Design a protein around this ligand. Sequence first.
Ligand code: ZN
Ligand code: ZN
Ligand code: ZN
Lengths: 266, 65, 44, 114
Amino acid sequence: EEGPQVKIREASKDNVDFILSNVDLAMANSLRRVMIAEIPTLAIDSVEVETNTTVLADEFIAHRLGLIPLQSMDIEQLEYSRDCFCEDHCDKCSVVLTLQAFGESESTTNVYSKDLVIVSNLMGRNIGHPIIQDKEGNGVLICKLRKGQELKLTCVAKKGIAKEHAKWGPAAAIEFEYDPWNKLKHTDYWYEQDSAKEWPQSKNCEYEDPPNEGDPFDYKAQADTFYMNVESVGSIPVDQVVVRGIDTLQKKVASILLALTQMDQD
Amino acid sequence: MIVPVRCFSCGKVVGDKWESYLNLLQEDELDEGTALSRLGLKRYCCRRMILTHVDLIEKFLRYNP
Amino acid sequence: LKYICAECSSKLSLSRTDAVRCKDCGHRILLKARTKRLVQFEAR
Amino acid sequence: MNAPDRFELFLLGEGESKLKIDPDTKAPNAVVITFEKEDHTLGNLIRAELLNDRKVLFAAYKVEHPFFARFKLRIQTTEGYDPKDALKNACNSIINKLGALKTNFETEWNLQTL
Ligand SMILES: [Zn+2]
Ligand SMILES: [Zn+2]
Ligand SMILES: [Zn+2]
């Protein structure tokens, strides 16, 4: 384009390994922070338990229910329950999905995330569906029932930010590394004998030029090349994770700009 | 109790990888390390999350009430 | 109201002036049944 | 028990404005702006982008307490240059760079496999 540059090294459904070029450190860091916390996601926020004769406690189940990864593709055309003009929740803000399990066989009856059944009206929006990256197609193991144990409950999932609770986290671990050769000298290495033989060599070293001992210290150098690897949980695709991250940062900057526009009022 | 749904440290889903893990230990007769590696648990925090966990719910289901 | 036994799967409904024991069991350990008025849980 | 609500980290309270522009009494042509319901994510970026402007003498942000989601940003510019305009230019620069970054990432993503 004209500004910052991206170089996708590896790409898959769950991970994106790329190189951010021509960017300030603070912008990369902020992008990381936004990707971690400030990205809207659909997750269980309300749990109504009717019958619960399982081993686990009520809120013990409700907790892991909250951590269940739900489809958050069209989450942007869903709304916050705190913003909607409805009582409690509705179809324009929340997604209601039920859970009815009961011990049938003599063996242990497992209760997975696939047993969750959407009840509310999605009206077209791709949302609410629990992510199943499981090979057998079961999903997250929620609970276990004996012979006559029953678990009947209802879940109201709402739009939320990971800043409010980690269950709304769209991404897992974000790999982040700049200057693999310590040419900026942002780090004074610890050692007992040899500094280089003890400390392992980064992979990203393959993508930069090693320093020459004949060359002095480059004091007028900054941080331009960043090596990142963004991993998604399933609620939001990796590309959409980083893109909605960027758009979120941009938007919350635009809100400050808008605030500056508004403070000119008499 | 039961396998934690997601890893504490990072946030990776590990609750769907319990049973499989067990299989990789008894069906394919692998060691814990390789089993954890095959499930896509490269970071040692999630690797911990599964390796360190004890499934107590099985002993809990032994009661009739 | 109603109660449920401990070491057997029953469903007694014996109110006051009855109490112990159980219906076709023999033991006196009686638990109280769950409320009908549901309670919500903030999945956090 | 005494723990505050989580949404207090991004939801503005009763009467709390987003920005609070205050005339800095120390050095002339300076200003301190209080950002509410924001953390290092915005502050560090804006501050770092305010140093790119060569007509800006001073620019520094700080979070006075981690308990509360807010930070103060002090800006001092040359005479004949209102600091609010420096903040605006910084913000717009950020937005433009982010947009270009998004476009670039999209074009780079459309050329991948698996
Ligand atoms: Zn609503
Ligand atoms: Zn982890
Ligand atoms: Zn009895």
